[PDB]
Subunit: 291 residues, 4 copies
């Protein structure tokens, strides 16, 4: 079947691997830059054009939508949807999942155990806000629109006060979250494809730091996750209505706490440390649901 | 009943009039700046705090959400919702309605007759894109994220070419739309509250211009709208799931063409040229649905 | 004589008072919005146009250049200069004085006693940077380009660490400065016009805060400044090549420490608490140097 | 001698070639990321720190200052200057040369023949502005602060009108410039090092386009420049006070017209099409002036 991959870049590992795993399974594959799409929305279901030509009808389409071109990207994805394609992750689920606040809210509402987090833009009693989330030490993450630019630890009460009113009226909102010290800087990225966790790794932060992220200098090992964690990661990915999701989990004394739910997570590190054909698993899932 | 008004400013005409019309009908009213809210999202339904104190439970809440504080604003609104308040316009309908692209798509999908419009970010054959929407003359509107900053007319083919690749790769997407010359610069803003158009005015652009907008220098008269227009404005406001909406319509030879659907439209001009108690009508609608 | 006032707004107190004090002394005055100027730079000295007409030759021009329209504002000012007008503050001195870093450097180079301050964008050893400026407590001010958006206090070592790497790689540079605790939140804004301090006030920060600024909630009294302070404020305003300057001073145990040097300072508070005709003094200075 | 290269990236061709040509001539070379510098400005001449250590005294320093980190970059460069290093391009000349408007003004003032250009931010009579620069066809370049994001051609009067008020009030200023049609899309980048043009190439725009730039798809040949062009390129680079400059010239019927003067131009294309050791020439110039 013919399938498109929406990604402004098609050389990076994940998009390359998807192209490869899809031709390998007997499919035709085009990689399309969203920003180079253009189409009539009115009338409904008018074809999409790409560099002077119409496009053929794609039976399915993988969105790898840049965190920064989200509105136009999801607009193009939604046109493909309205024209009949099958989305590996629907556009409205992508939109929902971008807004980290809307998502934490939806998760807590469904009884998913998250860490205790509060939110604030230009608050007026920083001491009240700190008391609200259980006091120091705390993690302050901040966000410009949907983009989060900083995650920082504050171990004292004054450090929290300083960071909060440093960001106060800075025109970005912020989350203050209980610092899971017991994680020792470790985070478990599970990768849900449809109704199963198909992979999982453990990221370990480099010494003197708490930031799990690989790029920030972290180790990546293979993770052996409890059945409880598997269950709650699938429930999370359901709650968000994602066909493909990257659920991040912190192991806290009271249990597993979801902290982030990505909707087009990177493949390279998790494949290269587990050896699982994840692109293949999601192309299977397409095959099983495409038409 | 106790009701909040979410607006970063509470002195401007519309918020003042809502406060006035609500105390006048025997209600308690607080005006809250969203950015000064702060709350726990986890656990679910934890109270909201405002300048060092908890808030009381509001039976309903009017969002007047700044076009620029939309994510945090709708997050706070959604907390009020999850805590039991009634929203005059739900948060997800607000979010949907912000994204002008998602909205034009949803409208065309429901068979609402819009003007022929195409969309594009970094297109590659400007001549193909112009041919796509019926050629010159055309209106090019552009948008940064959801924010639109410019609307401009292009009467020649070269003017359209110049404007398009002037914006090409400018990192904003753009809509190219058929210029409704027959409107002679006139636009009809209807105001839907629940299931009825409660007001309507006609904006006339100042000579030498096509931009209907009042601020851009336009006249405002009372509009007498056809029953067809009333029907299609209510259908539009339904389609978007808005309890209160400002539907803009261009009168084109083939009929009435929706062009914009605002979700917290300004009241001052439409009240001051019609004399209708619009704030009263929407407080009624609250009363009828609150609890 | 004919004189222009470059200010995007002409209703605010300072520009109104300048217009008033200038017509009152027998002069013709136009207030021009820089952004509405347009001119040929090549050939040199071609006239300036403003809303469809040429402008007359102004014998002098007061720049009140918005902190946010600085490049185009100073471009227009420089055209007036090249065309013969006299600038109350030259364009290159304005440009220099915007960049707070370049200015602190120039001041320290001339032996002006500033507080000990260090600068940093994406530093790599926050503990080394803190040790560099004498350790906690410290004031962290940050800047986007030339715009500074935040000033914040950090009293502990961990608070300083948290704020610094909260801003680290945030794409704004930052100054870390010795906290002058002995100022008890008090700051002395002197206003230099030519070769004399013509006014001065003391700003007192509201309790529980250290930020002197009036808007942030500060009291304004009349200041009686030492001759030393007068001397060093005139030297500072010289060093920057400003004809009109607002020099801010902190009273520290070792002496008076310049901390900020504005080049178009506001008049309203300092006039309304001292009763000095400051607009008159600078129109005099024009008269004395114009031609 | 010890010499630093200020560039946030040190792998790109120009910085690599400078390192190579400098060790090759018997010098010690460090490549420093400006944003990773941090220093005390007060007291004057306090050492610079880089990743936890002090820096040694550099006898000279090459700025390759990112167009986007200009203020902090030039601040760090100015610290090196005040500490005794020799700058291949001084910091204030760099600052001057960034602002394209200030620079066109300075050039026209010195009698350098530029193309006829006018400037405008939020003009009010677009037809007057077009008439001002000689009417269509025209080139509209626009700029955000100092950053220019778009260059576009307008061949008709309506195309110019459309583009201008498309950008009007867009919060960027714009230049309207006479379109040098006789250049047939060709531009001559000369590279001045001290008092001599050491290289020069001709860029040819790809068919259907007028944009000379290499990346935009242009050919690069070796240019044989008149003595007049050599003279006026050296005069331009003088006027700006640059030790190393990239002067761009359009060949117009009335003569050679400077159009752009870069202060850290790229080396790769001009070296790889001429075979001149340009990095060597500027390291020579250092040697001749260092100390
Ligand atoms: N509540 C927390 N407790 C401890 N560490 C956290 C917490 N939240 C985030 N982190 C750290 O930051 C990393 C990712 O945080 P995240 O919110 O994903 O920031 P980013 O969006 O930059 O990746 C994790 O590996 C983890 O170490
Ligand atoms: N397709 C069109 N044909 C004619 N005029 C239009 C068209 N689209 C917009 N306009 C003009 O612009 C005004 C509003 O356009 P709009 O998209 O709402 O811009 P804005 O968001 O700045 O208000 C209207 O009053 C109308 O005159
Ligand atoms: N080094 C310092 N020590 C104490 N207070 C300071 C210091 N620097 C700034 N402040 C406080 O902040 C106010 C202004 O700081 P400033 O740098 O001017 O910020 P802004 O640019 O927001 O006005 C002053 O009134 C003062 O109280
Ligand atoms: N006045 C002009 N006439 C013709 N072509 C021009 C003119 N100005 C710029 N260009 C074209 O654009 C290219 C560079 O323009 P420039 O201002 O340098 O834009 P950029 O900053 O994007 O490089 C040149 O090669 C040239 O073809
Ligand atoms: Mg993460
Ligand atoms: Mg409108
Ligand atoms: Mg200040
Ligand atoms: Mg160029």
């Amino acid at each position: 079947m013919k399938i498109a991959i929406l990604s402004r870049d098609g050389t990076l590992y994940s998009c390359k691997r998807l192209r490869e795993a899809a031709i390998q399974r007997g499919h035709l594959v085009e990689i399309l830059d969203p920003l180079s799409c253009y189409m009539n929305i009115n009338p409904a279901a008018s074809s999409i054009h790409y560099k002077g030509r119409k496009l053929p009808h794609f039976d399915a389409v993988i969105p790898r939508i840049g965190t920064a071109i989200t509105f136009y990207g999801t607009a193009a994805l939604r046109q493909f949807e309205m024209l009949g394609s099958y989305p590996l992750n629907e556009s409205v689920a992508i939109a929902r999942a971008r807004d980290k606040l809307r998502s934490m809210q939806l998760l807590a509402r469904q009884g998913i155990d998250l860490p205790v987090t509060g939110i604030a833009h230009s608050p007026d009693d920083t001491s009240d806000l700190i008391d609200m989330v259980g006091g120091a030490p705390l993690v302050v993450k901040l966000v410009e629109g949907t983009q989060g630019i900083g995650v920082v630890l504050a171990e004292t009460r004054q450090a929290a006060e300083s960071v909060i009113d440093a960001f106060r009226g800075l025109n970005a909102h912020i989350l203050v979250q209980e610092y899971i010290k017991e994680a020792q800087g470790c985070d478990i990225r599970c990768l849900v494809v449809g109704d199963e966790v198909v992979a999982a790794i453990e990221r370990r932060a480099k010494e003197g730091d708490f930031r799990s992220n690989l790029h920030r200098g972290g180790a990546a090992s293979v993770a052996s996750i409890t059945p409880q964690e598997r269950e709650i990661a699938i429930k999370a990915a359901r709650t968000m209505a994602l066909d493909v999701a990257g659920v991040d989990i912190l192991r806290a004394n009271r249990g597993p706490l979801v902290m982030e739910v990505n909707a087009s997570p990177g493949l390279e590190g998790i494949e290269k440390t587990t050896g699982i054909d994840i692109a293949g698993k999601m192309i299977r899932w397409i095959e099983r649901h495409a038409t």
